[model samples]
Target chain A: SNAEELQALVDNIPAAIYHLDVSGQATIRFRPPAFLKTLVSEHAGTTRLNTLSMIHHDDRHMLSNAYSKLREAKHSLTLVYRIVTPEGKLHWIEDHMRSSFSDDGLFSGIDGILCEVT
Target chain B: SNAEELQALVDNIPAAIYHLDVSGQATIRFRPPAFLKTLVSEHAGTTRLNTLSMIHHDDRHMLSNAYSKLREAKHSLTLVYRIVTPEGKLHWIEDHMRSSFSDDGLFSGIDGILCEVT
Candidate 1:
């Protein structure tokens, strides 16, 4: 019941919840909000790049750098970046993420949420 | 297993997760970080005011306004306010909250996370 309640709440929240694996795989825990789905290229297949491709060119470096830092022992990070939609509409996304570590102390992946902000 | 995994992740995240009932009762789901615990007054009893009293006087109005808006059909809100510690240290807290509604369409309460930011 706790899981169901949490799932319901997560599904109704006005944000996107995700888990990214160390192997670069990503799982969206709930239905991606309409605006967020637009960030994935229709023809880009299922690769992580499908979403990364939508990040504004100027902001890619910041995201890359954040991930790099997270991999290096950072426990958490908050990032605000721009996403350019197919129609060229620009939206600001606030990403709040925390790193997950393996029992052996390796950075395993991340749990995060993406909120679209002005 | 899912609950265990989720609990583990929630416990290790660098923020405080909470649920507030419509009656103003608040439940902190994970262990409160040391800095956050300092926000409660030792003599303030267990009432919500215990924490409210720690909010900087100048920022209480903002928090009040945000709660008012959330009760009036706002689905989600992001708030940044200041908290004054017992030792008079000022810290910025970023609150990300989303309102929960009952099946009959009544506003139930809120699910939120508090992150201490610079």
Candidate 2:
């Protein structure tokens, strides 16, 4: 229902956006700014859009660990991580989001925001 | 060239937003959903974190101690922590990042993404 308006609001906000599924993958990326969009499109289909993939090689395990907890209803999650821009810039962001479940408890969405600080 | 499109993509889709400087400070939070945003914007403003200041009292000291270690460490850091929402919902988030320095030896930025994984 509001997803359309929501998406529209996000798209024009001049901020980087992303969507994650319960499985912890970066399922979607919104429009980035002029400086960042260039690097991403140049590397289209890059796994960077996926949070798990963008995870630092060392932090993947812990990130994965947290993902499992949310899936099991143990807890929601928030975190800070780094990603290498397509042009080879390393940046950081802090994230906070909880699990979304359908009426019957099926995984629906991650429902969060990303603020590009680099 | 592609920064425009990349910005378009990040602004349109959905996910947690973030951008941190090298000083271990949070400079930004991406566009979060209405539900989660209301909770975070209401209670997330504080010193270092929330749950560390509320529930995980013991861990707060431990986190502080660890922060000191990271300052002097010769290796990488990976950690997990829990946060409490204004409504008292507990959430977890993991963090990972390597130290960064500008070419001229100045702190430029934190190149990372805060994944809102389930």
Candidate 3:
């Protein structure tokens, strides 16, 4: 049917989707294939996203700067960062994030899509 | 570059990704094209997906049973259900879900992928 074809066209792709909650917690709303699961097995929770724990130690500062700008209510941005997996592998990630708000406007959240580049 | 080519090949397709937290809250980690956004506008948050508010009234029972089985630790399953959008449009959704456990086997969560079949 039109559904399966169209859906499979995207569902099988090796990219992940993420959301940052109002408290700036990072959740892997979606993930890539199983092979890369270990790449992020550590940071896959609600509050961990706010910390730079999953981020590479070297590139953590870049994301720190980025989040600072976000707190200032900056617009959407695309960022590239490095990751060191639990298995001691080197990988790169590309993240595209946009700002979103609740219907009542009392709180806001961030929506982001990510892909592994290495 | 290889990254852009592979990413674009799937990122723009008409499929959305979702996750169910340990509390059974549904979060749309990724969304389809803009046209289908309204189809799920009311249910684009957490905790709501578990309420069956997004699932069509007639199909709600099936999902309720499915969740019960998952809570009992049943294996993965595929479900096809209908969604009644806020605009009163009818769309069918295909969902594949698997039960997941924590590193220490304490808490559990569900991972699911979805596509619309209107």
Candidate 4:
């Protein structure tokens, strides 16, 4: 059912695929390109990145703000930003999102993409 | 000679060991027994992701590039860089390396490892 349900929604995505619950916590991250690193790669620590724990120390406030919104928003609004790597590399992404509702209009999940533009 | 030297050098370090081939393409990456994502969770927001697009502007370009290596080279190399998240997280890192050589010192494959630390 999940596959069938996603067919119409994800039949044409070249960026990324993801799902979130009403709480705005990532529930699932679908397939991304192999060169792409997921959360598993961001903080896995094997590749010299702690991901979230290592925010640039300047935008820490903004990161905090994004999380605060994630905790309370009824609808979804995605963002586009750059990620800095330990080797000091900068990556760019444009995240667009909307949510899913159940047959009774209850919140189902959120889905989106993260494309590498730079 | 390099292999013997690394064996002696790496017997003491606890985090991880790596070598940037003569071309700096990660000549080798070593590990112990830690089962997990090498980086970090993508983002616990709605999924388990936090890839680097949200990284600071100055560092993303370095993270995504393979190397200064465009066509090919004749020696091994090493480099270090920092990573900043869009929300401003930062991670400090170091790298060590070597280049394998043919009987006449031709560059060969690359092996390396990345580590994230406080």
TM-score leader: 3
Question: What are the candidates' individual DockQ scores?
Answer: 0.02, 0.05, 0.11, 0.04
Alpha-carbon runs more than 4 Å astray in model 3 = A1-31, A39-52, A100-109, B1-118
Task: Report lDDT (CA) for all predictions.
Answer: 0.52, 0.42, 0.50, 0.37
Docking class for model 4 is incorrect
lDDT of 3 by residue, B1-118 (tens): 2223444465444332333232323243544334344432223232123213667888988987886676557367777888776677676666665665557753265655545443
Q: Write the per-residue lDDT of candidate 1 for residues B2-47, one digit (tens) a residue.
A: 2233334443322222232223222322223445544432222221
Measured against the true structure, the TM-scores of the candidates, in listed sequence, are 0.36, 0.34, 0.39, 0.28
lDDT of 3 at B4: 38
Restricted to chain B, the TM-score per model reads: 0.61, 0.43, 0.58, 0.36
Task: After superposing candidate 4 on the true structure, give the runs of residues whose Cα lies further than 4 Å from its correct spot.
Answer: A1-10, A13-31, A42-51, A97-112, B1-118
| Alpha carbon lDDT at B47, candidate 2 | 14
Native contact fraction, candidates in order:
0.00, 0.10, 0.07, 0.07
In the order shown, the candidates' Cα RMSDs to the true structure are 18.2, 19.5, 12.0, 21.9
Best by DockQ: 3
Candidate 4 reaches a DockQ of 0.04
Residue-pair clashes, model 4: 75
Residues A1-118 of candidate 3 have per-residue lDDT tens digits of 2333544566444332223232323233543334344432222332123212467888988986875565456357667787776666666666665555457642255555455553
